[PDB]
Symmetry: C3
Subunit: 117 residues, 3 copies
């Protein structure tokens, strides 16, 4: 899966090693191998979340198969909120998530697409 985290926390307020811990967390939550998880963190941005510029974060999760239902995504959301609230020292009111199903023809890897792998 592809996880992207935008935050207005400066880089020096994002704990060292977050991106690797988020790989491990996502592996467990989403039922994916940790060595296939992708994480991108973009800190130091200018953000408002629900109208407020206090510290916040926006997570996007794009994945094959597992992020397409409300019932599944409810579960995923609970677990990612637990992870991020504690890691980033943010309240639950300061994080939102978006879930994006992907299909194999959308993922370019090793010079082809996943459809053929």
């Amino acid at each position: 899966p592809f996880l992207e985290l935008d935050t207005n926390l400066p880089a020096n307020r994002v704990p060292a090693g977050l991106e690797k811990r988020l790989c491990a967390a996502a592996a467990s939550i989403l039922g994916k191998p940790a060595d296939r998880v992708n994480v991108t963190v973009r800190p130091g941005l200018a953000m408002a979340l629900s109208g407020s510029t206090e510290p916040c974060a926006q997570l996007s999760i794009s994945s094959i198969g597992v992020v397409g239902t409300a019932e599944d995504n409810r579960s995923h959301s609970a677990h990612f909120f637990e992870f991020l609230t504690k890691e980033l020292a943010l309240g639950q009111d300061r994080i939102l998530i978006r879930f994006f199903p992907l299909e194999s023809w959308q993922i370019g890897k090793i010079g082809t697409v996943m459809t053929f792998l």
Copy 2:
């Protein structure tokens, strides 16, 4: 709604308070409560827009219900171009927008998804 603005303007050429003014603008344009609008600004990037690296900006707008039609999006576009051209001191040739409908099962909030709220 979720608004994301990438620009090659350095942070010191993006007017102070833009993210909050964009919340207010988006609320009016999209018919959404200002206290529910989300804005992310990512300045200082390396960008070409229509082949040119002159100052530019890319806006993405993701929302439930209101960004799914050409006729609606035409209107939204006109209003967001008015806002951003003046705020960023950019010509209309230096901004593009993408519109992304979302469904409630895609939005993780307070440890669940919007489907259940």
Copy 3:
């Protein structure tokens, strides 16, 4: 088309002029005019790709008409991997691509949407 490149290479390890060379490359690969290509590069990020924080890059390509099939996207992927591996001095294991079809009603330009242009 809209090309977005996230990398944990610092800006000073992304070759000068990349964004314009990527416009030219994308024009040839995707069959689009170079003067209509859009590129956004976001360097210096904190990233893991396939669980590893070694240098890597994530490309997203969003376009009308040409990024909707596996067979097409296979070809596009091969060419973009050739371009980026050499430009960024990255192995093929350190790049992934996502392809996103767009429709004309999603693209805001000059205060309207492409549907009406």
